[PDB]
Amino acid sequence: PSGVEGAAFQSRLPHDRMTSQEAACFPDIISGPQQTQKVFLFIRNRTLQLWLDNPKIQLTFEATLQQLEAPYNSDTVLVHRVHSYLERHGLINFGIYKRIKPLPTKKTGKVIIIGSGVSGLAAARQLQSFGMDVTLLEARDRVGGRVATFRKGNYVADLGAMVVTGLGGNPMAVVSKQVNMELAKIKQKCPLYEANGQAVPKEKDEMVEQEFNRLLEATSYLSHQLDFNVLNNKPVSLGQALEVVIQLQEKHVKDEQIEHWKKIVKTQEELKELLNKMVNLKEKIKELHQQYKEASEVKPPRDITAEFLVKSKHRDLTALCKEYDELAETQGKLEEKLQELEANPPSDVYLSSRDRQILDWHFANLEFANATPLSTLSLKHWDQDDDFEFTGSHLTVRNGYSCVPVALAEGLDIKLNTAVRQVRYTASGCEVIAVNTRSTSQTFIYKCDAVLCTLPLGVLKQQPPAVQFVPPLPEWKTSAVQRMGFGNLNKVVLCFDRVFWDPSVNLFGHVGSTTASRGELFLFWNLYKAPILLALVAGEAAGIMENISDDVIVGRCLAILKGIFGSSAVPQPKETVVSRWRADPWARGSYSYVAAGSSGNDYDLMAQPITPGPSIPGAPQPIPRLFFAGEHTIRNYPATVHGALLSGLREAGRIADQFLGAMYTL
Amino acid sequence: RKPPKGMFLSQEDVEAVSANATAATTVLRQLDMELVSVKRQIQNIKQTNSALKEKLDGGIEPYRLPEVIQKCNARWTTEEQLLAVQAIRKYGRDFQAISDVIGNKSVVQVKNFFVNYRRRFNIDEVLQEWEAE
């Protein structure tokens, strides 16, 4: 869309309805007259537009009211109530803008923020923007968390996120304007190269893919229409359900041969019965000719019975010959209605051995998308977010994604090499105890009003705990931490002196030999200005590869590439890097996924803040003290940079409301 | 509403392939067998049918009797009548045969005969005697 309505869409909101979140704050308006609702919505949309068209500078209440028109800019308590709501929840003036009114001389309240990944930084910026004392504790010696970018000379390659998923409504759309990131598109054309190292023909390539997509929807039908969602008490996984479909397609293939050749025999065996009738006719016919011949020997003149006899047998014979002729008739008909059936056998196979291998590369693509063995994804939910998809085509960051955190990080109080070890939160505040990563015994205490926890789910999952909560996290929170899925995926960065792949090809795949190794180096990316190739390790493989020395891996890599490009177009790599995220202690994996037995609803559980007990018993119920943001917290945009950023904005809104109060609800 | 065009998945079928850990390969093997057990009993009835085809070799050509192209008459030669009577005795009512035998009388002059001469050929007796067979 576009105009004022572009804004509502670009900001992920229905241009002609107030959201639940808005209802909450403007219950006067939404419960009131239709006329007013329209005014409101417009104001919202308009402001949005204004922010959007120019997101390199703060947008004040005044600057707004200014461009607003009558009748709309008549009621200024609305325009104020609205500009504020928007600002509070990072819909406007988020990211990196230029301040008009520099930052409130003295600050209010104090917040500790665990981790300076995007969710971290994003929330920090907001909070600081709202005038709070904010400090970030980061275990690593760089910002960005799971947004790694490798730099050396002019080699530049992400080991973290890498793709932006289309700007149509994507908050990153704004950041992209705010920060100098070079955004290049992904040309969706991806050639495949079997185990041998030779292209897969446009023939197969298309049939398999398309069978793949067919097989997917297939599961989707089992799920919704047949309700195949529990089995032997366990929740059913996507993998299971894909097997059960492939099986059934194999079954049906056979079922068809069976009743095709079974139609042959029922014909072939009419042909038996007919021949028997035919032989046993050439039978009497034989011996009847005899009798006629014999009774035509009696020479004339003859008496009448002997004459009749000749005349008789003569009939009986042309009679039996009519009969047997109408049968040779019939015979010839069946004899063809049999090459008919022999000409069209149904398919020999559901999938060939070369087929079912290629289908596997398509399953590895999915394994990659979700960072996990499809045997783990909840069938019922694995794709619940596929509704909230952005529009426009996917991109990559040509100049390394890290450029974004570093930009956000700017102007913020950040303690690198500071590993939070224990979180303690009480009726009247929290204290956070971290150590220094270099000499571990060297200890730190941070006192604050609220802690916002951006720890990866992997980290939150660690047994035994890497961070300790005091008092421990409620059983409803821990359960959600177990139920949820934290997957894995790894990168291999190949750095050369010369381009030797097709320069107009962003991505090309490799087709491993087995189901088992479907994920192993299954896809490559030419993304960058330098001669760099990126190799994915996904699915079951990813976990196992972390256990293998760099060299070996880079071995298998060149190996494959020679196979595809000729055994001497491929030099030695000048520089090579390899991720091990399940290994990395500040990640313990790649990003979350809806595991079997979880749901979208567990993500909500993750975001629900924690309210301590009371100190003095029979004292009033406290404020909530411990808050969560991060990729795993956001029902609708999980495992993504934009999703994190978003959750960060969310918790800031929520924290600020809490400690600075929401004036705009009156 | 319905599975993808060409994808097959009946309700009842699914429950069958999930029933245990290898109801999977069980069912797909029963058919693998069940098939050859047909594919094979083709040969059998193809070879049965093959020998029977060779017995019928030679058609009936040596046994064919030339064309009796001849015209209907009104006159019932005493010869013709006698052929008639014995035709009845051995044929009952198949007026077509009876016609074909006498050679030159339409399927109805025959019927008429039955009534005229019924009189003096005791066609009653003759006929009931054919019923004894």
Ligand SMILES: [C]C1=C([C])[C]=C2C(=[C]1)N([C][C]([O])[C]([O])[C]([O])[C]OP([O])(=O)OP([O])(=O)O[C][C]1O[C](N3[C]=NC4=C3N=[C]N=C4[N])[C]([O])[C]1[O])C1=NC(=O)[N]C(=O)C1=N2C(=O)[C][C]C1=[C][C]=C(Br)[C]=[C]1
């Ligand atoms: C790994 C990965 C890779 C390799 C790739 C990718 C990815 C991943 N993805 C995802 C993203 O990246 C994520 O989500 C984000 O980044 C996240 O963020 P946050 O939430 O914020 O978190 P982080 O970052 O991690 O941060 C955190 C922090 O904290 C800290 N710590 C820990 N511990 C501790 C600490 N501190 C203190 N103390 C203690 N103890 C750490 O260190 C940190 O800093 C992605 N995404 C996107 O968007 N894109 C892309 O591309 C991606 N990638 C790929 O490639 C694929 C994926 C995807 C998916 C889905 C979709 Br729809 C798209 C894409």
